[PDB]
Amino acid sequence: ALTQERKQEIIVNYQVHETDTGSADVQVAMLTERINRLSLHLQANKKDHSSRRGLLKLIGQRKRLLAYIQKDSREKYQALIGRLGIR
Amino acid sequence: SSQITIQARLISFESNRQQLWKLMADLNTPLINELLCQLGQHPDFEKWQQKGKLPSTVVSQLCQPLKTDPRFAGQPSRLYMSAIHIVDYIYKSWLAIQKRLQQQLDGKTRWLEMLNSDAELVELSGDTLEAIRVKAAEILAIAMSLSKTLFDAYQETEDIKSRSAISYLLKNGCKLTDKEEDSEKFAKRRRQVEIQIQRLTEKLISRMPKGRDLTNAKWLETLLTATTTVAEDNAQAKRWQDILLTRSSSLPFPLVFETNEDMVWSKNQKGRLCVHFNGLSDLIFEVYCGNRQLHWFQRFLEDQQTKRKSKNQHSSGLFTLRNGHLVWLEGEGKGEPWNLHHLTLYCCVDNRLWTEEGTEIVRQEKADEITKFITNMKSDTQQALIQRKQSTLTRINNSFERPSQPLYQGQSHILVGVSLGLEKPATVAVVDAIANKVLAYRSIKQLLGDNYELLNRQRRQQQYLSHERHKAQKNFSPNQFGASELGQHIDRLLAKAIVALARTYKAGSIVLPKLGDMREVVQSEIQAIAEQKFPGYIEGQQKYAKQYRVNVHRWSYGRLIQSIQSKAAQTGIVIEEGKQPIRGSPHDKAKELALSAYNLRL
RNA sequence: AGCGCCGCAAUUCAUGCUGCUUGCAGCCUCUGAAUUUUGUUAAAUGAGGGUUAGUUUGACUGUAUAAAUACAGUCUUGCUUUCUGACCCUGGUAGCUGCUCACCCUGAUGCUGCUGUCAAUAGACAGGAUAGGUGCGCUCCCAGCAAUAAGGGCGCGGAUGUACUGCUGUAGUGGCUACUGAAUCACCCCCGAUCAAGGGGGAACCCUCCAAAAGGUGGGUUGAAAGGAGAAGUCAUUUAAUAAGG
């Protein structure tokens, strides 16, 4: 689970502006935090198929959002994935 | 069916178990995986599928350069040989499956072409129905194997009248019929064949044998990829998911010892039977078995000692032990795998080799087969093969002095027919065939006797355990179980009851039905009905008769047939195959099954 | 209600019984078949989870016999399963982590359903398979909930280029890991083993036998079965995720 402080820090860091809470860039940043933590869990917990179910959802959610961003703008898309460290 | 398996736990100190586990998991199973990969890429692979046969030596040839590859080099000679046998039998299995499926697809595709309705047969013959009926009466009078003979007659007879007459004659089960064709029952029967062709076509897209990766390196690298990389499209992400859901293989492939003397038996000073394997004699394993099997493991030592006392003038061709499989059974709980899992030896024996009379049966079977071989076989190593065969043929004459038990004698005119059904798994009729009289019926309830309550237990547990799995799946709970072992128990109880009744009436044989593939018949029948009832509504079609289709997929007619065949062979009762009639009750089906198998003796 | 199962009762009958004439004719006690009712103080079924290298289901040889098997002697090992008993539980402490929820309507193979102290709110404590409904049981039905089947309705905020997102708490409910609680058994107790390991001591009932009012040698017994296994492919069902399909 994700703390409100880490959540709000993600919001502030990826916001387009101070009241943006839901742009696709903020959404993929939130999902990237979740995917990173859950990958570390599943590397240690291969039999946690319940948690693995969540990963496949989260990876798909981010895949759809990044594909949406990429055809709004490749400049914003490339900058965003570079910040998040996604190849 | 005189080959059976007996098993024992193998016990040894930890360093022996660890060394064997590492040989199996780190070298032998990776070698098997590599052989499966290379064999599936071989340029002759596509012609092996057409022959349905693997070359006798191609796995051995592929393994030779791998025996000194740093990935695989550390193994005894018999472990390489075991890996070869594993891989060779896998493809012998898989190529035989694909070959038969292809023949089924070709056979039914021809039938779909020659299945024409009388409205179509009128046009395609150019003759009135009475005219083709007469021509079918002539062609039947010549073809008098009848089915195959008509299928032979069809192909090269390009004369559309005779060709249509054969089509009409085959539509009716190789016979004349006066009655009119019900056009909707024909259209349904045509549709069944299309579904069967489609389902055969889909089954022929089987995967190549997948192997056992025990490291699961592909899973972890895919996890790192899918979490840090953008998927190029949906199909890459789907392939990632398909890998991430794939479950890890825990256990290596077992070892196979096709030379019975590669298991060397001994008794330790604490009096326990012990075994070691060729190439691993430093690892002594202690035999821990039930007394109900101990007499076999004692026999393995006595057979070994007999041939040593005779300075190898006996043949191991008559050793009661045939081969061994060395298996790790999955342990519950946690530990290092050589501690967690339990090492188990499975020995094939031929039950006839227990007695002296049965050994004489095997000796003649061996002698005839080897005398045939030596005559037909006639290089230096091929001449050495002849000399080994001639040594076997000489040495099988030396007796092991085994227990004498006179062979079963059954009356040729007394048969037991066993009717198999979805509702009543077995029903038997003892028939005196020259008298044409039933000596005894038994129902399923009389066969099970006091065990009959197990049959309601099975139905009740199959319902209950399916529903508990359904509930557990939604929670991702691992606690998913089923009644397969109870079902196996019931089929073995029935098999013993049937054979005991056969012995009691001195039946010469047990008659079993040629059911064919009941599941593909039922599945294509129900689909053809459902497509009429739910046109354009696939989920309605799949809901239709769902529980009947499930019941037919659970019907264990093969396991019951196999259990009967094994028990009859262990008492020397002949098994015969007959055709079960569709008419009548299970009792009448069993009687007419028995009597038809008697009349089919030619 | 429906469906499955269970027995009950009834009819007909042969795989049952009776007879001389051994292939037929009666009958329905027994042992079974055909599915026909019916739920009764009946007789049968009965599904919360777990607990033994448990016992019996063996091998060989001799003797007997019509097989079936039976008796006597010698040997015995612990595997993989199916039942019947008996016993124990309703779990604990830290971590990791999924899913769910703005709100409303409908209600899914959804969730929950025991007893009795206490107790207005809240659940706790002590019992415990008697666990909602019927003879028993269900995904059916009843009652409460339903966000965690599907759908539908409809707020403000972000976003609005096809992605969607927030309203979400010491929250509800799953999974995984580590350690840990009870039975860890086959007549009972105690001390041990668990890749090997057994030892000691008792209670009932029956044999065997001093010549005997009385207890006591030498033993026996204290629930049964089944077995052909590995490897590879496939089908079916269900669950989860994904996609809108070349």
Query: Is the distance from CB of B209 to CB of B36 less than 8 angstroms?
Result: yes
Please give the Cα distance from B395 to B387 (Å, whole number): 12
For the beta carbon of residue B86, count every other beta carbon within 10 angstroms: 20
- Beta carbons of B260 and B87 less than 8 angstroms apart: no
Residues 6+ apart with CB under 8 A from B115: B167, B171, B189, B190, B193
Q: What resolution does the deposited structure have, in angstroms?
A: 2.3
> Do the Cβ atoms of B229 and A87 come within 8 Å?
yes
Q: Does residue B505 approach strand C to less than 7 Å at its CB?
A: no
What's the first-to-final CA gap in chain A, in angstroms? 25
Q: Which among B237, B240, B244 has the least Cβ separation from residue A52? A: B244
Inter-residue contact B455 to B491 (CB < 8 Å): no
Strand partners, B576: B511
Instruction: Read off the tokens for A3.
Output: 């703390």
Strand C–CB B495 distance below 7 A: yes
Reported as type and span, the H/E element at residue A22 is none
DSSP β-ladder status, B411-419 and B507-513: parallel
Half-sphere exposure of A25 (CA within 13 A, CB side): 20
How far apart are alpha carbons B296 and B351 in whole angstroms?
10
Q: By CA distance, what is A37's nearest residue in B?
A: B227
The answer to whether the CB of B490 falls within 8 A of the CB of B458 is yes
Report d(CA B573, CA B409) in Å as an integer: 8
CB within 8 Å of B138: residues ≥ 6 apart: B165
Q: What is the rounded distance in angstroms from the CA atom of residue B63 to the CA atom of residue B28? A: 11
Helix (H, G, I), strand (E, B) or coil at B321: strand
Tokens of B305: 């000692």
DSSP state of B318: G
Method of elucidation: cryo-EM
Q: Which residues of chain B have a CB within 8 Å of the CB of A50?
A: 475-476
Is B537 within 7 A of strand C by CB distance?
Answer: no
Largest separation between any pair of C-alpha atoms in chain A: 41
Q: Which residues contact B214 (CB under 8 A, 6 or more apart)?
A: B25, B29, B248, B249, B250, B251, B252
Dihedral, A31, A32, A38, A43 alpha carbons, nearest 10: 150
Closest listed residue to residue B258, CA positions, set B316, B202, B297, B207? B316
Q: Would you state the structure tokens that stand for residue B390, as one six-digit string? A: 């001639």
Among residues B174, B122, B134, the alpha carbon closest in space to that of B151 is found at B174
Q: Which nucleotide is nearest to A73 (CA to C1')?
A: C161
Closest CA to B527 of B196, B212, B223: B196
User: Is the Cβ of B264 closer than 8 Å to some Cβ of chain A?
Assistant: no
Which 22-41 residues of chain A approach strand C with CB closer than 7 Å? 22-24, 26-27, 34, 37-38, 40-41
- Residue B357 CA to residue B404 CA, distance in Å, equals 6
Distance CA B147, CA B173 (A): 8
Place of tokens 């967690």: B340
Q: Which residues, 6+ apart, have CB-to-CB distance to B565 below 8 Å?
A: B1, B512, B575
Q: Which of B227, B248, B476 sits opposite A39 (nearest CB)?
A: B227
Q: How far apart (Å, rounded) are the C-alpha atoms in residues B163 and B125? A: 8
B520: amino acid identity, one letter: E
Closest CA to B430 of B515, B514, B498: B498
Which residues from 333-352 of B have any strand C atom under 7 Å from their CB? Answer: 334, 338-344, 346, 348
Is residue B135 within 8 A of residue B165, CB to CB? The reply is yes
Q: Among candidates B263, B356, B287, B369, which has minimal Cα distance to B318? A: B356
**Scanning every residue of chain A, which has its alpha carbon at the shortest distance from the alpha carbon of B228?**
A86
Residue nearest to nucleotide C44 (CA to C1'): B453
Please report, for residues A36, A83, B237, the alpha-carbon distance to residue A29 in angstroms, rounded to integers and kept in the order given: 11, 9, 19
| B155-186 CB burial, b ≥16 within 10 A, e <16 | eeeeeebbbbbbbbbbbeebeeeeeebeeeeb
Q: Is B219 on the interface with A (CB under 8 A)?
A: yes
The pair phi, psi for residue B413, each rounded to 5°, is: -85, -5
Measured distance CA(B436)–CA(B433) in Å, rounded? 5
Q: Which nucleotides of C are covered by protein (CB under 7 A)?
A: 4-6, 15-16, 31-35, 45-47, 49-50, 53, 57-61, 67-69, 76-83, 95-99, 109-111, 138-139, 149, 157-166, 169, 171, 174-179, 195-197, 225-245
B240 to A49: CB separation less than 8 angstroms, yes or no: no
Determine the distance from the C-alpha atom of residue B49 to the mean position of all C-alpha atoms in its chain, rounded to a whole number. Answer: 20
Query: Which of B215, B218, B227 has the most A C-beta neighbours within 10 Å, making it the best mutation to test the interface with A?
Result: B227
Alpha carbons B429 and B502: distance in angstroms, whole number: 10
Q: What DSSP line would sit under B239-300, residue for residue? A: HHHHHHHPPPP-SPPPEEE-SGGGEEEEE-TTS-EEEEETT-TT--EEEE--HHHHHHHHHH
Round to a whole number and report the distance in Å from the CA of B276 to the C1' of C210.
Answer: 60
Q: Which residues 394-423 in chain B have a CB closer than 7 A to strand C?
A: 403-405
* Residue B542 φ then ψ, to 5°: -75, -30
Residue B167 has which token pair? 């089509």
Question: What spatial distance separates the first Cα and last Cα of chain B, rounded to whole Å?
Answer: 23
| Residue B442: other Cβ atoms inside 10 A | 21
Beta-sheet strands, E only, within A1-87: none
Q: Is B543 in contact with B450 (CB distance < 8 Å)? A: no
Residue B510: strand pairing partners: B416, B575
Beta bridge partners of residue B267, listed in sequence order: B273
Listed residue (B440, B461, B434, B420) closest to B558, CA to CA? B420
Do B392 and B400 meet the contact criterion of CB atoms below 8 Å apart?
Answer: no
**C-alpha B245: how far from chain center:** 29
Q: How far apart are CA B100 and CA B520, in angstroms?
A: 15
Maximum pairwise Cα distance, chain B: 90
d(CA B472, CA B54): 43
Token digits for B334?
């946690």
Given its phi and psi angles, is residue B420 left (phi above 0), alpha (psi -120 to 50 degrees) or beta?
beta
